[PDB]
Design a protein around this ligand. Structure first.
Ligand SMILES: N[C@@H](CC(=O)O)C(=O)O
Ligand SMILES: N[C@@H](CC(=O)O)C(=O)O
Lengths: 618, 289, 294
């Protein structure tokens, strides 16, 4: 950040050659004639007849020292540059810039102030001294381990991990209500426990502008949030990070509103949060538990309920969208995705994950970057003043029923089939992804990755088939209702649009090739069943969309995907046979004599190339 | 000795000693088996135990057939010794459970604060906790609680044991085993005390190992062992709970808060062995007792 | 009944009684197979008297929630389905009694030792011995399967009932305790040794029912494994199983040795320094090991 400001400030100096300024500004520039060493282009001694350059030249010096102090502290832990020679908070930086601004405007030069100087002020206000605020994320159970070791050391017959949720809250609230320190070096610590406490120590030693949210993975309960609040205070984080539960499993989402209501009802926490709360949802995470359709509908409803809780307690709720959702697609589709949020879930505060596989398309090219900022800003503003229609009672009822069917189908394959993990390990490069428990313990990113590579995409569509089939069978007029929902209900339309996009990236013929080369023949019937499910699910999706072909309503994306496919297919075929050559010691190939002027390297290249080719799915 | 520890790897409470109790009882019983019937018998019993404990680990049907090939090779006399042995081991395991349950310390922070607390002794409300919830959560007055308590009756109806009527002197042997188990793991136990408790435990294990009127007398055995003294001990606790919610009265001593009934020698449903004379006998026995 | 379990479960069992059915007057059978655990040890005796007294007093100053109308209606239908399945096996299968007399020691219980015509204690006893427990769980499987197929939202309603309605929670908890005392592998062994081959398919059908019913019970309780909410009981049962399993295998082979004059065994030379006495010992020991079920 300091380097970016420093490589820009001389342009402001060159441009602001004006001599007219206010009495206040002259005073400020006359002093600084004795409180150019380091520079990029602007080498000359600055005369007092150029007052803005005097002010801005001093900012340049502070920025140089800010940059170099950070470089030294980073590189060799130590710095000879005193903090008082640098900008340590953004207020110090903004003050001389805003002085320049008001002086120019007072002297008739507000058109000039509204040029580069205004751009610079907006950069400082957008990016601050860090460019980004850093989220800290850690699993709930890791905090429970810390509190268990602490209480076990108290030798009182039981420890934190034994206690009920209500018992944990009781102990946490007495600690939080009290003055007694929790710590002392009198604590036996595992590696993992020291890692948690040292993380908080590092936080406590750094400027608070460096950090954003403390995110709790696998959060379920109020004690999860209070545990972190206690540990922050007792590790001497003077400005504690806001604490953000990430509710992942479907059952955790169902319980999230009551958990948040309990937190808001606790006086200490209510006072702590000062009218604001962030809650994180993770689409890929919840789809791995229960299938994508049921995660999507439960996430819609969980946000409806969280808004009700937030309104009751007078808290301003920010939903943090984790990866895998329609808002994570980038491009145009993101625009309707934001507008499709349940009413009042945005309320002037949008927080969205920019997935790494999407960042290049979202920000790499300057026009696309502009249009990304624009659609996020426009859709956020519009949503608060123009919520989407609320679903008709019969739409909710049908979705409530389909979600049960879809989860049942998804879980019957993914968790109940005794040989699923076996098949998964063969049909898929998942194990090789790691080289360079079952599915429950597997992370969401490898889960999506593994089936993305084989062009099968099972995590994204599995369960839509049974659900649509059940709905159409139950009542012949549900097909027309599903199509009305696609036409009229933004949430349902963006949900289906994403599925259609992922099917357009899929090829069951390629997936069948991975089976042929890599899967035991006793499992070939299983893969064939999954591919028949793929095909039936695709056609029921197309029926719901009123489309004869995938992406019928988006010829631009269809063209783009078609032009990638031939390269991706080559990498697929290459990856499948390379996996066989790596795995099967009895696989014979006839090499041709070397053509051009390890197989593991080829495998890595195919995985990166295929991922770059397919970008975002679920 | 352990392997039990592999059957049950985790402790369920910090004061959980159940595996240790079982290992101790099993170790001493096997020595007694060896003293009485020889090392070969003991080694066979020990082999059967390992096979079935292996079965509990994975539940392979082939381990049951290994068990069978040993068991089916036993003549009638050896079959009796082996089935007696494993029956007695079960009895010892149940005594250890009783000691463990009796002395598992209450962790209040285990309570959830809802009705599910009442499905486990580790979380259920005792009588004063019941009083206090009725006052603070149901707005009942201590006078209302006291008045309802005075007029209430719990009537426990004893029925006969469908397979085994256990005689009073065996119950006493079982209580001494339990008492040894409890004392053996006390905090600052002396080495000679522990040595003597171990020798007492061994001799009581060995002593234990070696008509409708009869069923009734057997079934009336719990009054002298625990219920006779247990009833006024609990009624004294009710008094204590009453004072702690502001009722200074004791439960009136003639209030029938607790009554016991019996079917033993009275239930003739599909049992012609229960005759009018049997009924007269058990009435006289009960009055004599 | 659930009030006959003794231990902690009895406490909630009493509180789960329909409103106003206690009204200061509790009368409860103390089953012989439970009296030792209820009263044998002085602390446990005290705690037995305490929980009966406290739950009686609390009930009816604090009746449990009345069931929601949709809970009533679902159970009314499930009861029809469960009775049909139970009766279709126990009374309407022409070979059921034959299979019952082979697969269990019920005939050998009934010539010593203490279907419409059979008394309830022998009925429960026979299937307890072989670790199968058919009288306790049969009918739950069809009922749960029917309910989830009838309306897909009944899966979630059944789980709400287990969480919110004491009557339904204690009813499921007892089934789950009995499944934890079951082992279809041991039951299968009794079939292999004692049941004619033309009835093996029937037996295997019952065991598939056992397994499906167990998993439907677990799903309704929100549990991945039996007694997930009661690790204390789970530990106790696990430490008993080894000795009971030994007596089961011994009992099954002893029954074949007693019944089948053409079953040849190779005795080993006498080790220790009638087969009926062994059978009796295994029956008493297995019953002592399994205590209360249904
Ligand atoms: N990001 C695009 C697809 C792609 O570029 O791969 C979409 O979501 O429609
Ligand atoms: N009586 C216990 C089980 C047992 O001890 O066998 C219960 O009902 O949970």
């Amino acid at each position: 950040a300091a380097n970016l400001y420093y490589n820009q400030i001389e342009n402001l100096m060159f441009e602001l050659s004006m001599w007219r300024c206010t009495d206040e500004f002259r005073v400020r520039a006359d002093e600084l004639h004795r409180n150019a060493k380091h520079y990029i282009e602007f080498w000359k001694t600055i005369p007092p007849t150029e007052p803005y350059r005097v002010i801005l030249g001093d900012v340049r010096d502070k920025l140089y020292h800010t940059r170099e102090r950070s470089r030294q502290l980073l590189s060799n832990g130590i710095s000879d540059i005193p903090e008082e020679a640098t900008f340590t908070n953004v207020e110090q930086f903004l003050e001389p810039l805003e002085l320049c601004y008001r002086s120019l405007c007072s002297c008739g030069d507000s058109p000039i102030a509204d040029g580069s100087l205004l751009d610079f002020l907006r950069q400082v206000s957008t990016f601050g001294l860090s460019l980004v605020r850093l989220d800290i994320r850690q699993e709930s159970e890791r905090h429970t381990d810390v509190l268990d070791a602490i209480t076990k050391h108290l030798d009182i017959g039981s420890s934190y991990r034994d206690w009920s949720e209500e018992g944990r809250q009781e102990w946490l609230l007495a600690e939080l209500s009290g003055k007694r320190p929790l710590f002392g070096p009198d604590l036996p610590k595992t590696e993992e426990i020291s890692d948690v406490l040292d993380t908080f120590k590092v936080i406590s030693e750094l400027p608070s502008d460096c950090f954003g949210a403390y995110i709790i993975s696998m959060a379920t309960s109020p004690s999860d949030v209070l545990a972190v609040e206690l540990l922050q205070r007792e590790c001497h984080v003077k400005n504690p990070l806001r604490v953000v539960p990430l509710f992942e499993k479907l059952a955790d989402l169902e319980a999230a509103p009551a958990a948040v209501a309990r937190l808001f009802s606790i006086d200490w926490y209510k006072n702590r949060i000062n009218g604001k709360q962030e809650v994180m949802i993770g689409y890929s995470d919840s789809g791995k538990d229960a299938g994508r359709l049921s995660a999507a509908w439960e996430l819609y409803k969980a946000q409806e309920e969280l808004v009700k809780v937030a309104k009751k307690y007078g808290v301003k709720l920010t939903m943090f969208h984790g990866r895998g959702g329609t808002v994570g697609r980038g491009g145009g589709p993101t625009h309707l995705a934001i507008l499709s949020q349940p009413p009042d879930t945005v309320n002037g505060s949008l927080r969205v994950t920019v997935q790494g596989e999407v960042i290049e398309q979202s920000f790499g090219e300057a026009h696309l970057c502009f249009r990304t900022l624009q659609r996020f800003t426009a859709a956020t503003l519009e949503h608060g003043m123009n919520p989407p229609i609320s679903p008709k009672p019969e739409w909710r009822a049908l979705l409530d029923e389909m979600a049960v069917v879809a989860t049942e189908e998804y879980r019957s394959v993914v968790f109940q089939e005794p040989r699923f993990v076996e098949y998964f390990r063969l049909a898929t490069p998942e194990l090789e992804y790691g080289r360079m428990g079952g599915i429950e313990s597997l992370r969401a990113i490898p889960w999506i990755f593994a089936w993305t590579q084989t062009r099968f995409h099972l995590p994204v569509w599995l369960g839509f088939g049974a659900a649509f089939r059940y709905a159409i069978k139950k009542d012949v007029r549900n097909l027309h209702m599903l199509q009305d929902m696609y036409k009229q209900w933004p949430f349902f339309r963006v949900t289906i649009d994403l599925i259609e996009m992922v099917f357009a990236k899929g090829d069951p013929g390629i997936a069948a090739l991975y089976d042929k080369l890599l899967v035991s023949e006793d499992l070939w019937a299983f893969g064939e069943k999954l591919r028949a499910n793929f095909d039936e699910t695709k056609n029921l999706v197309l029926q719901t969309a009123g489309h004869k072909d995938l992406l019928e309503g988006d010829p631009y994306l269809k063209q783009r995907l078609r032009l990638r496919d031939s390269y991706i297919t080559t990498l697929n075929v290459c990856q499948a046979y390379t996996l066989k050559r790596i795995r099967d010691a009895n696989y014979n190939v006839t090499l041709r004599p070397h053509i051009s002027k390890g197989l593991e390297d080829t495998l890595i290249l195919t995985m990166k190339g295929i991922a770059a080719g397919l970008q975002n799915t679920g | 000795d352990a392997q039990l520890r592999q059957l049950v790897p985790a402790k369920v409470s910090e004061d959980d000693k159940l595996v240790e109790y079982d290992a101790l009882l099993l170790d001493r019983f096997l020595d007694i088996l060896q003293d009485l019937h020889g090392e070969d018998l003991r080694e066979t019993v020990q082999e059967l135990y390992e096979l079935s404990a292996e079965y509990e680990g994975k539940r392979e049907p082939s381990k049951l057939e290994e068990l069978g090939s040993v068991l089916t090779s036993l003549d009638p006399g050896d079959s009796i010794v082996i089935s007696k042995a494993f029956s007695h081991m079960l009895n010892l395991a149940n005594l250890a459970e009783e000691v463990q349950i009796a002395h598992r310390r209450r962790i209040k922070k285990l309570k959830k604060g809802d009705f599910v607390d009442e499905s486990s002794a580790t979380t259920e409300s005792d009588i004063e906790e019941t009083f206090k919830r009725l006052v603070s959560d149901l707005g009942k007055s201590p006078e209302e609680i006291f008045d309802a308590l005075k007029n209430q009756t719990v009537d426990l109806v004893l029925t006969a044991h469908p397979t085994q009527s256990v005689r009073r002197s065996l119950l006493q042997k079982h209580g001494r085993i339990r008492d040894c188990l409890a004392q053996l793991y006390a905090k600052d136990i002396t080495p000679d005390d522990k040595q003597e408790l171990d020798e007492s435990l061994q001799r009581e294990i060995q002593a234990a190992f070696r008509t409708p009127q009869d069923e009734m007398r057997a079934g009336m055995s719990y009054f002298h062992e625990t219920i006779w003294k247990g009833v006024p001990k609990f009624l004294r606790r009710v008094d204590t709970a009453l004072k702690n919610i502001g009722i200074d009265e004791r439960v009136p001593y003639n209030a029938p808060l607790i009554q016991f009934s019996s079917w033993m020698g009275g239930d003739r449903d599909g049992n012609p062995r229960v005759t009018p004379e049997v009924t007269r006998d058990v009435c006289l026995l009960a009055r004599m007792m | 009944g659930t009030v006959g379990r003794g231990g902690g479960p009895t406490h909630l069992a009493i509180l789960s009684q329909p409103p106003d059915t206690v009204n200061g007057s509790l009368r409860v059978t103390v089953q012989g197979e439970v009296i030792e655990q209820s009263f044998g040890e002085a602390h446990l005796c005290f705690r037995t008297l305490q929980r009966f007294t406290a739950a009686t007093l609390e009930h009816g100053m604090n009746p449990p929630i009345s069931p929601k109308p949709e809970w009533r209606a679902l159970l009314d239908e499930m009861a029809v389905v469960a009775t049909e399945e139970y009766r279709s096996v126990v009374f309407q299968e022409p070979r059921f009694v034959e299979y019952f007399r082979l697969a269990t020691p019920e005939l050998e219980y009934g010539r010593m030792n203490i279907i419409e015509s059979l008394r309830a204690i022998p009925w429960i006893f026979a299937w307890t011995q072989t670790r199968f427990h058919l009288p306790v769980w049969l009918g739950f499987g069809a009922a749960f399967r029917y309910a989830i197929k009838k309306d897909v939202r009944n899966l979630h309603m059944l789980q709400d009932m287990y969480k919110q309605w004491p009557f339904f929670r204690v009813t499921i908890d007892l089934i789950e305790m009995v499944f934890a005392k079951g082992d279809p592998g041991i039951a299968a062994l009794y079939d292999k040794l004692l049941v004619s081959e033309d009835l093996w398919a029937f037996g295997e059908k019952l065991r598939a029912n056992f397994d499906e019913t167990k998993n439907l019970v677990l799903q309704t309780a929100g549990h991945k494994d039996l007694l997930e909410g009661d690790p204390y009981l789970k530990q106790r049962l696990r430490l008993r199983d080894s000795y009971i399993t030994t007596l089961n295998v011994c009992q099954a082979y002893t029954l074949k040795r007693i019944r089948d004059a053409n079953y040849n065994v190779t005795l080993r030379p006498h080790i220790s320094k009638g087969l009926e006495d062994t059978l009796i010992l295994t029956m008493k020991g297995i019953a002592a090991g399994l205590q209360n079920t249904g």
